[PDB]
Amino acid sequence: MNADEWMTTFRENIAQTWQQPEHYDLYIPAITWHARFAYDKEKTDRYNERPWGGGFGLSRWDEKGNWHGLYAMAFKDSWNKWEPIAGYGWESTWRPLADENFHLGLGFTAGVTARDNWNYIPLPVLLPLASVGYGPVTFQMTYIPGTYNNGNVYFAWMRFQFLEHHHHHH
């Protein structure tokens, strides 16, 4: 009587996980070449090899008007080693009354930094962040309150939204 009606509850969870979400987020540093004069390179074709880094994660929707943001960025040194980084938080995306050209959001974001083998404890952190949607690209600023040097420094990072969903038959 219980295992019957209760089974449907779990069966719904296994079905969702089996399908997996439908969103691919990639955290990439904010760069800009520009330069005074487009300098060319002799010999050697294609792009140059230089491990910079990057992050990957997913998104979640909340019926209670909540936008969960999960992303994991990893940094690989040039001559030392690489260390991953996990981060999760919540933010509220606000859309204007006209079109989807400019997006504005705000909320809190948490981050955990761990290293070495799997035994020690990581380093949890909580800092405010702002969401800004401009064109096909997304920008997220990081705020950090405190009275030390500036106490009002604003950071900016580049983000690429990937929406993949092909096939429709198992």
Read off the CATH number of the domain in which 7 is found: 2.40.160.20
Smallest Cα–Cα separation from 162: which of 24, 58, 61?
A: 24
Q: How many domains does the chain have?
A: 1
Angular region, 10: left φ>0, alpha ψ -120 to 50, beta rest: alpha
- Please count the other Cβ atoms lying within 10 Å of the Cβ belonging to residue 131: 21
CA 51 to CA 80: how far, in whole Å? 12
Alpha helices for the chain (secondary structure H): 2-19
Structural domain for 18, as ranges: 1-170
Strand partners, 73: 55, 85
- Catalytic residue list: 34, 77-78
- Nearest to 91, CA basis, from 119, 59, 67, 118: 67
The CB-side HSE value for 57 (13 A sphere, CA atoms) comes to 20
Alpha carbons 157 and 27: distance in angstroms, whole number: 8
